[PDB]
């Protein structure tokens, strides 16, 4: 398949799911440009390189927890009951929660590496799972 998808077995129900290393995506259905545009939301912790944001002056909540509300608002992304763009307005560490999780459009080179190596393996449209970088954990989508 794609760049980093490989095959793997539901440990609840048992069927085949597709999995990527790279963007941390899973999907039940088996699935580079130059430069892309995607939007995030960031979930700090106490581990973070700055442990500070536009919600909270201190954040104190470990990386543990910050993965815990991540997972939820995947969840309720996939689900349909929250809008990405909605959670991350109201929910994302980053200054660019403002724009609704907007970072714009770039190509490599730019970034902290796990998460441009996300971005470039994601389809348009395409959401990530987790992915960690030292700024916490981020939920990435590609919108162009
Ligand atoms: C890991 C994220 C993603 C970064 C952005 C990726 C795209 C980009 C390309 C550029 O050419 C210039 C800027 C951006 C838009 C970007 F690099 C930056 O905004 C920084 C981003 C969000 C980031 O590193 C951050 O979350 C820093 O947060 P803290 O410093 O508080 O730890």
Known sequence: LPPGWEKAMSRSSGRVYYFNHITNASQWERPEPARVRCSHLLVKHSQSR?????????????????????????????????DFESLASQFSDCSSAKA????????????????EDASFALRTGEMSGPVFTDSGIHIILRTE
């Open 100 to 115: 609704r999780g907007d970072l714009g459009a770039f190509s490599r080179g730019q970034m902290q590496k796990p998460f």
């Open 50 to 82: 700055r442990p500070s944001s536009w919600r909270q002056e201190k954040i104190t909540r470990t990386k543990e927890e910050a993965l815990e509300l991540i997972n939820g608002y995947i969840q309720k992304i996939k689900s349909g009951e929250e």
